[PDB]
């Protein structure tokens, strides 16, 4: 075919995996594909250099980059480790001049990055900073002032330096293009007058997730200005209980006919929750993670949500609330039950294994679970696995490390074995409770589609990790803390590591000597020892490192390691 014809065929091919196969059919396709590829997804920012991406794919309009590993969320990655996006922005600034979208996760993003984005990318439309840190409201002010075509500013779970809420006032009066605004992580109060005018002049606004600083008494005002909203994150959800205030909120929310997703609810007062009831016949997503209201209050809401597909809730729901959920929400796909008091040992709520069993039995489309509880049985896990062979993500956190089945006192090996045995398309698993090498044997035998596994306080010996690396065909990320896994399984399965995004091991048994030898053996891996005790050389080769992070890369050793990171 003529090159224009082939470029046009490829315009209908947008999945990364398909673009990649295309680039490998012949030399001609390689060149044509690279020159009209529209988006790149870089799941590990250090797996490749900016120059390499920009040279290969010159016409990119959308970039997604991910930095720090998942365990950074749990304070296991010391500050300064890395993840700086500036070199990427700098490199793109002179090349990707038609650039439209930047989506970043766990990166360090500075005001200099944000200023360079504003001034470099005239067509800039989408900024998502997901669990990012290193910038302030001043950087946001630069985006607001300058990005005249901006459609999405989404700051989900980011840590922002809250210098001043004045940044939002920088959107000029001629700006009208906003579609999605998520400021839920911002501690500083924006000018409410500026927010009200912004919402009023942006008729394509579909998603508005506010910060806690917008008080419940002002919510109706904004909702009246945005009746087309599909997603709403409330601000503060507390006020003096008054008839006129409740009625105003009720009327405003009932005028929002397209609302499918509701979240926020900080400081929620039970007296004001019924105001959302009109909305909850059509709701598909409800996030009640921050509402500390009790089971019965949650049930009255949930009874009104027959179309619910995704629920995030505190363990205040309790077993009785989950039993009601199981009866009501037949389209439920995803349930996340978060701990109300994660740092207390004795239970503060009646949420046990029984709630998860109830939903597994009652919700035929339930395929994603994240569940925090204090007790579990093998019988429960076996019932779950048998009821829900369609499960694709199963994340179970028993609060006390190494807690056995509370009825039999046995490890939870057979229970998690049943999950991997019965749930053939399980892509994600996290384990907890008392676990021996046997569970890892089951995982290696049965979990052939598992891509991500998270493990803590589990196993007996290197045989455990060996079973996983040897048997888990689809494995992409393995992240382990505080397990008796060490040199033997790691080096015995070194080649497996070239088939994965990364392996994280902290507080395990891996010696500095094994890290050095692995680095020697596998020059296309970056084997990073992350250790705050000073030079690993200053200790015997046999001494375990605090952490090791290993990832395949085409770029070679990183140029930005802090003093406490060493590449082998």
């Amino acid at each position: 075919f003529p090159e224009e014809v082939l470029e046009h065929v490829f315009s209908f091919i947008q999945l990364d995996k398909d673009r990649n196969s295309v680039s490998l059919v012949c030399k001609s396709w390689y060149e044509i594909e690279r020159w009209c590829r529209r988006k790149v997804f870089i799941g590990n920012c250090y797996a490749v250099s900016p120059a390499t991406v920009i040279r290969r794919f010159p016409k990119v309009r959308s970039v997604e980059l991910k930095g720090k590993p998942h365990f950074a969320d749990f304070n296991l990655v010391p500050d300064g480790w890395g993840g700086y996006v500036y070199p990427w922005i700098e490199a793109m600034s002179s090349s990707y001049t038609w650039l439209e979208e930047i989506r970043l996760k766990r990166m360090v993003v500075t005001d200099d990055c944000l200023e360079l984005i504003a001034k470099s990318f005239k067509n800039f439309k989408v900024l998502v900073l997901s669990s990012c840190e290193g910038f302030s409201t001043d950087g946001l002010a630069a985006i607001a002032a300058t990005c005249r075509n901006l459609k999405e500013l989404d700051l989900r779970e980011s840590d922002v330096d809250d210098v001043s809420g004045h940044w939002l006032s920088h959107f000029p009066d001629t700006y009208t293009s906003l579609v999605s605004l998520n400021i839920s992580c911002l501690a500083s109060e924006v000018s409410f007058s500026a927010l009200e005018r912004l919402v009023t002049r942006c008729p394509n606004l579909k998603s508005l997730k506010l910060n806690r600083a917008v008080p419940l008494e002002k919510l109706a005002t904004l909702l009246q200005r945005a009746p087309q909203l599909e997603e709403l994150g409330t601000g503060g959800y507390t006020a003096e209980v008054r008839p006129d205030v409740y009625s105003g909120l009720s009327v405003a929310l009932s005028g929002c006919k397209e609302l499918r997703c509701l979240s926020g609810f900080w400081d929620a007062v039970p007296a004001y929750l019924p105001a959302v009831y009109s909305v909850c016949s059509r709701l598909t997503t409800l996030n009640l993670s921050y509402a500390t209201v009790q089971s019965y209050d949650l049930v009255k809401l949930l009874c009104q949500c027959p179309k619910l597909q995704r629920l995030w809730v505190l363990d205040y729901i309790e077993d009785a609330g989950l039993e009601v959920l199981a009866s009501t929400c037949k389209d439920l796909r995803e349930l996340r039950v978060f701990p109300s008091e994660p740092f207390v040992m004795e239970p503060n709520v009646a949420l046990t294994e029984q709630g998860l069993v109830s939903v597994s039995m009652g919700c035929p489309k339930l395929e994603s679970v994240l569940y925090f509880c204090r007790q579990m049985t093998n019988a429960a896990l076996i019932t779950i696995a048998r009821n829900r062979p369609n499960m694709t993500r199963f994340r179970l956190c028993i609060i006390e490390p190494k807690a056995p089945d509370y009825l039999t006192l046995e490890p939870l090996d057979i229970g998690f074995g049943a999950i991997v045995e019965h749930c053939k398309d399980l892509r994600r698993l996290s384990l907890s409770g008392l676990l021996t090498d046997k569970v890892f044997e089951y995982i290696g035998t049965y979990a052939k589609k598992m891509e991500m596994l998270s493990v803590a306080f589990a196993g007996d010996s290197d045989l455990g990790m060996h079973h996983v690396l040897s048997g888990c065909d689809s494995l992409r990320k393995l992240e382990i803390r505080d397990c008796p896994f060490g040199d033997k399984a790691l080096l015995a399965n070194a080649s497996k590591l070239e088939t994965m995004r990364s392996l994280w091991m902290s507080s395990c048994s891996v010696s500095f000597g094994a890290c050095k030898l692995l680095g020697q053996k596998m020059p296309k891996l970056n084997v990073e020892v992350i250790d705050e005790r000073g030079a690993p050389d200053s200790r015997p080769e046999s001494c375990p490192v605090e952490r090791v992070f290993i990832y395949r890369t085409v770029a070679g050793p990183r140029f930005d390691m802090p003093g406490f990171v060493w590449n082998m």
């Binding site: 749990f74 304070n75 701990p339």
Partner: peptide, 13 residues
């Protein structure tokens, strides 16, 4: 007590 356990983003209080 254990660092980063349970695996949540909550402040300790």
């Amino acid at each position: 007590q254990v660092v980063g356990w349970p695996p949540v983003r909550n402040y300790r209080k």
